[PDB]
């Protein structure tokens, strides 16, 4: 056997932050892990394509922000952009 | 003297029951045998993991449920409640499967 990676612990921590009482089964863990991987792949691929179009050779924060703006719908885009900007601002200092 | 329902009520009860639950609706062994028969044509002497068959069954059931959901609307559009093969063909043509 070898190490197999997943997002189980982080999803569990987020669930405990949101809903202190409820619990989560294994199939829900698999579904959430697959969804997270899918969204990560989508956003990263769109950001890479956006970087390649502009003849640049790097993926800065603004390209991820524009990819999020392109992918997510109108209502979720504002909240996602606000969360990302807040996280970046808190991290930079 | 005996009691029996009018045509249609049992159909509505079955619709409610099946939309309420989530279990699979195709028998496992016949579907596994059909999958093996289809696969043996492409490459002989194959083996299947216990999860690949389940994933195939889930995908097929979801696709068939979606197709019947579209077929019901196609049938209702023509002032009918019965679904017939022309409805399925029209839905497939519109969806782009064979257009």
């Amino acid at each position: 056997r070898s190490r197999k990676e997943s997002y189980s612990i982080y999803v569990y921590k987020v669930l405990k932050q949101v809903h202190p009482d409820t619990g989560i089964s294994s199939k829900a863990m698999g579904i959430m892990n697959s969804f997270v991987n899918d969204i990560f792949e989508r956003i990263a691929g769109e950001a890479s394509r956006l970087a390649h179009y502009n003849k640049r050779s790097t993926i800065t924060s603004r390209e991820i922000q524009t990819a999020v703006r392109l992918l997510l719908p109108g209502e979720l885009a504002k909240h996602a952009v606000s969360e990302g900007t807040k996280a970046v601002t808190k991290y930079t200092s | 003297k005996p009691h029996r329902y009018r045509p249609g009520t049992v159909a509505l009860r079955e619709i409610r029951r099946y939309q309420k639950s989530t279990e699979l609706l195709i028998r496992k062994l016949p579907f596994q045998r059909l999958v093996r028969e289809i696969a043996q044509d492409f490459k002989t002497d194959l083996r299947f993991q216990s999860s690949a068959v389940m994933a195939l069954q889930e995908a097929c059931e979801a696709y068939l449920v979606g197709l019947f959901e579209d077929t019901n609307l196609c049938a209702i559009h023509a002032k009918r409640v019965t679904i017939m093969p022309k409805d399925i063909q029209l839905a497939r043509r519109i969806r782009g499967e064979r257009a």
Partner: protein, 83 residues
């Protein structure tokens, strides 16, 4: 150990159950053959890609990951089996 015409294993009650889940109240008598044909076509299309994936990797047992990849390639992503 050859297998012949196992497509008849998708019996009429199973098709009626699937239609009931899909929201159909009344079903004609010629639906079953069309449903069997459509299911056979879809299975062939998915399994061809699955076999190609398992043959490029030099193996003899198809894994669920190959089926998931084939479904994603065809445009129907599936959660609950890794990825």
């Amino acid at each position: 150990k050859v297998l012949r015409d196992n497509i008849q294993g998708i019996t009429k009650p199973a098709i009626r159950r699937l239609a009931r889940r899909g929201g159909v109240k009344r079903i004609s008598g010629l639906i079953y053959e069309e449903t069997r044909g459509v299911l056979k076509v879809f299975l062939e299309n998915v399994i061809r890609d699955a076999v190609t994936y398992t043959e490029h990797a030099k193996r003899k047992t198809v894994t669920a990951m190959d089926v998931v990849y084939a479904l994603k390639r065809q445009g129907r992503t599936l959660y609950g089996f890794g990825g």
